Amino acid sequence: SEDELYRQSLEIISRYLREQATGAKDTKPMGRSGATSRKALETLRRVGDGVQRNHETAFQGMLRKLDIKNEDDVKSLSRVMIHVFSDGVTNWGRIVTLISFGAFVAKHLKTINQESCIEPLAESITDVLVRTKRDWLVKQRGWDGFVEFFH
Ligand SMILES: CCc1sc2ncnc(N[C@H](Cc3ccccc3)C(=O)O)c2c1-c1cccc(Cl)c1C
Numbered sequence: 368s369e370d371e372l373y374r375q376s377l378e379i380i381s382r383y384l385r386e387q388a389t390g391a392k393d394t395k396p397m398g399r400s401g402a403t404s405r406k407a408l409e410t411l412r413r414v415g416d417g418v419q420r421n422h423e424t425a426f427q428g429m430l431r432k433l434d435i436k437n438e439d440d441v442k443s444l445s446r447v448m449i450h451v452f453s454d455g456v457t458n459w460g461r462i463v464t465l466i467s468f469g470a471f472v473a474k475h476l477k478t479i480n481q482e483s484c485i486e487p488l489a490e491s492i493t494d495v496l497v498r499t500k501r502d503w504l505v506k507q508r509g510w511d512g513f514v515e516f517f518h
């Protein structure tokens with residue numbers, strides 16, 4: 368892991384999904400550019416919470432269709448995310464939608480007592496994001512670009 372973008376992405380996305388599922392903020396320290404990661408996480412909270420509230424019926428509809436019951440079902444979610452996310456256009460709107468839906472699924476995992484699947488889902492979403500949109504993210508200045516875009 369000589370890959371700061373992946374590490375920083377995994378930290379932000381893992382922390383968001385964990386706090387959304389449990390309702391508790393994580394007090395573990397951030398790594399390297401914590402100042403950016405902290406601002407990105409605060410942005411994700413405002414915009415990601417907005418997406419889940421505004422599009423609740425759509426998210427509930429997709430969740431019902433995916434019938435998530437365990438680690439096996441979370442693994443096939445990953446494959447749907449590459450098809451849906453990777454085959455469409457790239458912008459922070461779609462990236463926030465992917466992560467927001469991750470957080471929605473994370474709350475479901477906590478509701479069905481499968482908390483152990485939240486960290487793997489976060490890894491899977493981070494993999495989709497950084498593996499498929501690497502050059503776009505670097506061109507946009509990564510999570511610094513994310514913070515700046517949402518003011
Ligand atoms: C597999 C679920 C995913 S992953 C993903 N990543 C990026 N964008 C997505 N959907 C938007 C359309 C949309 C925006 C807001 C709310 C609902 C849909 C896109 O493709 O541009 C999606 C959807 C996805 C795709 C279709 C429906 C639903 Cl509910 C989701 C969560």
Ligand SMILES: [Mg+2]
């Ligand atoms: Mg919007």
